[PDB]
């Protein structure tokens, strides 16, 4: 069940919200981090959430409209142009075998 990332909508009006859904959260997962872009780059982390600690720590890419949910779903509010593009999600697991899985959305 390979971790997938439908965005709702795909094509988002400026000022409207978009919600990145996640469909196959594994078991024995320690947490999720969202990144802006295609690769999992530290400099470009949106936010992480450890489920045990149940604590989400904004990364350097956070704009304070994201509200990450415990089901790994994101939700970016009041979107504008620079949001457009890809968003890798990584899920790190107890045994340190991780799962990248990227989604998209385009703003008009």
């Amino acid at each position: 069940a390979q971790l997938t990332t439908e965005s709702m909508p795909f094509n988002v009006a400026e000022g409207k919200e978009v919600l990145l859904l996640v469909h196959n959260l594994p078991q024995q997962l320690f947490g999720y981090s969202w990144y802006k872009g295609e690769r999992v780059d530290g400099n470009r982390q949106i936010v992480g959430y450890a489920i045990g600690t149940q604590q989400a720590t904004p990364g350097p890419a956070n704009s304070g409209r994201e509200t990450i949910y415990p089901n790994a779903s994101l939700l970016i509010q009041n979107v504008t142009q620079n949001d457009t593009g890809f968003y890798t999600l990584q899920v790190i697991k107890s045994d340190l075998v991780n799962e990248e899985a990227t989604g998209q959305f385009h703003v008009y």
């Binding site: 999720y32 981090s33 992480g48 045994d95």
Partner: protein, 103 residues
């Protein structure tokens, strides 16, 4: 039945400097590792810090080089690693990381 070992037993490192170590856990029946403790201690916010090269992964002979990026000054702990197999055997083997300044 289960072996579990951690390369440099009691590690020490200067702040800013990184930490290498290699976890090695082998046994009859599929062995998997548990870094629950290593993660909560050194990756409390989820982040790309900690690389984990599984040099010869295998079903039964799991070896992994972990690399904890850019230790901060207040990150000294003893950390308990774990290995579990199919029959239902667990193994806790602990190890220490300790960090300091240079000037």
């Amino acid at each position: 039945k289960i072996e579990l070992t951690v390369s440099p037993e009691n590690i020490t490192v200067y702040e800013g400097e990184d930490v290498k170590f290699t976890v090695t856990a082998k046994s009859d029946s599929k062995t998997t590792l548990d870094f629950s403790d290593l993660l909560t201690k050194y990756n409390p916010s989820v982040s790309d810090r900690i690389s984990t090269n599984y040099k010869t992964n295998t079903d039964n002979h799991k070896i992994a080089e972990i690399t904890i990026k850019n230790l901060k000054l207040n990150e000294s702990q003893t950390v308990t690693l774990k290995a579990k197999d199919d029959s239902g055997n667990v193994v806790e083997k602990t190890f220490t990381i300790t960090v300091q300044k240079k000037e």
